[PDB]
Amino acid sequence: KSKLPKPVQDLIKMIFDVESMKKAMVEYEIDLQKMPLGKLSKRQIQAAYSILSEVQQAVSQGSSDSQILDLSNRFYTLIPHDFGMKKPPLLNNADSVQAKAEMLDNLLDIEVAYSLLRGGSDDSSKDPIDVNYEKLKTDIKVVDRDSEEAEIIRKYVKNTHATTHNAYDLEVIDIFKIEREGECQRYKPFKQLHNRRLLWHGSRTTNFAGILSQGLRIAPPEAPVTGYMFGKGIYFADMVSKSANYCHTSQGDPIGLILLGEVALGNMYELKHASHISKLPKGKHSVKGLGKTTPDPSANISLDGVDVPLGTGISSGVNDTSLLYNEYIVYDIAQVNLKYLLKLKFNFKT
Ligand SMILES: O=c1[nH]c2cc(CN3CCCC3)ccc2n2cccc12
């Protein structure tokens, strides 16, 4: 039987939950009969990215009907939905394709996830959990509650979480220290890069099997460009409140997972509005999206050189921005070093 700590075994089940994969899909109105998990293929998701990009181009071009209705029918044919005696929604605007594009993203993490699960050895010698664990390629340990680390992380979570978006309260059930296999010699060269910060990265529970196995990736060129604030990259927040919004928890499933990663930001390109960048100005290595709020800078604490902005949220310098909180973006995968994984319970104020 498994020699892992219980909280670790419990985390493994959480991330390899098949039911959660199905619920996440039906919740998207995906027809499970025609498109079951087993029929999920990346090649089919890439094609849908491409059709969605083809709809944005037609939308922005202002095509004469028939063209939008056909491209819309093409997408719904490739990605089987079930809306009953009602035709799917016409993808004729930016809001509409962005929603579909974000859908494909998670659908892909589910496909990646299911591929990992339904793959490997079929023996019965080792207990599944130990097998599933090995599939992640990440060393996972429990962070003691009465540990300075845990205290740091708890303060960061509590401080950067306030009462103006307090439609819920956050309680840390488990903190895990993470080290993905190899994710060391890849980040190290960037470790000689100042402006290293400990930042948040929230994501739905069904996307962790993928993020751990392969780390945080960047969207492919075929993906639609609509919705992105600062181009295709890895998005981080310095306030748990902003990130917590991507865990997609509810009263039914009140438990999510949040990542704390060290990011070698370097000199940041500071912006206040959505820009088409991805290509940095010479001498800059990251983008900072200036939010109206930011943790009180006076309460920053750098660890090992790593900056930890756990200050309580204050009004920032400028609110003439389009963002409510700070956003940090990197366009190189080796600039991130995932350090912690948090399991959190959300208590809704309703
Ligand atoms: O912490 C963050 N997580 C996050 C997650 C998503 C959704 N994933 C993208 C691909 C699959 C699901 C989208 C935007 C963010 N984000 C933006 C600023 C900070 C975060």
Swiss-Prot record:
Mutagenesis or variant effect for residue 104 to A: Increased auto-poly-ADP-ribosylation
Effect of residue 107 to A: Increased auto-poly-ADP-ribosylation
Binding residues annotated for NAD(+), in chain numbering: 201-203, 210, 217, 243
Ranges of residues in domain PARP alpha-helical: 1-118
Modified residues annotated as Phosphoserine in this record: 121, 125
PARP catalytic domain residues: 127-350
Effect of residue 327 to A/D/Q/K: Poly-ADP-ribosyltransferase activity is inhibited while mono-ADP-ribosyltransferase activity is not affected; only monomers are added. Disrupts interaction with CHD1L and ability to recruit PARP2 to DNA damage sites
Annotated consequence of substituting residue 210 to S: Does not affect DNA-independent poly-ADP-ribosyltransferase activity
Cross-link (Glycyl lysine isopeptide (Lys-Gly) (interchain with G-Cter in SUMO2)): 87
Reported impact of residue 209 to S/L: Increased DNA-independent poly-ADP-ribosyltransferase activity
UniProt crosslink position (Glycyl lysine isopeptide (Lys-Gly) (interchain with G-Cter in SUMO1)): 87
Result after altering residue 221 to G: Does not affect DNA-independent poly-ADP-ribosyltransferase activity
Residue positions of the active site: 327 (for poly [adp-ribose] polymerase activity)
Record's subcellular location: Cytoplasm
Subunit and interaction comment: Interacts (when auto-poly-ADP-ribosylated) with AIFM1.
Entry function: Promotes AIFM1-mediated apoptosis. This form, which translocates into the cytoplasm following cleavage by caspase-3 (CASP3) and caspase-7 (CASP7) in response to apoptosis, is auto-poly-ADP-ribosylated and serves as a poly-ADP-ribose carrier to induce AIFM1-mediated apoptosis.
Protein name: Poly [ADP-ribose] polymerase 1, processed C-terminus
Organism annotation: Homo sapiens (Human)
Full-protein residues shown: 662 to 1011 of 1014
